[PDB]
Structure 1
Amino acid sequence: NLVQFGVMIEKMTGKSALQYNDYGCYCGIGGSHWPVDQTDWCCHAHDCCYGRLEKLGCEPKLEKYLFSVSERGIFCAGRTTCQRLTCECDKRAALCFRRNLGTYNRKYAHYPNKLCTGPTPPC
Structure 2
Amino acid sequence: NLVQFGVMIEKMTGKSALQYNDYGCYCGIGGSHWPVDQTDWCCHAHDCCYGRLEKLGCEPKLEKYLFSVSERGIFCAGRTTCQRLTCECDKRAALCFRRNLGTYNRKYAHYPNKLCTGPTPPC
Classify the TM-score, shorter chain: over 0.9
Q: TM (normalized to structure 1)?
A: 1.00
Distance 2:114 2:44 in 1: 18
Question: Aligned-pair RMSD on alpha carbons?
Answer: 0.2
The gaps in structure 2 that reach 5 residues or longer are none
Offset from partner CA, 1:74-112 (integer Å, 9 cap, x none): 000000000000000000000000000000000000000
> Per-residue CA shift, 1:37-82, capped at 9, x if unaligned?
0000000000000000000000000000000000000000000000
How far apart are residue 21 of structure 1 and its match?
Answer: 0.3
- Aligned-partner SS, 1:74: strand
What number of residue pairs does the alignment pair up? 123
Identity %: 100
Rounded to whole Å, the distance in 2 between the matches of 1:21 and 1:104 is 13
CA distance in 2, matches of 1:82, 1:115: 35
Unmatched runs of 5 consecutive residues or more in structure 1: none
TM-score normalized with structure 2 length: 1.00
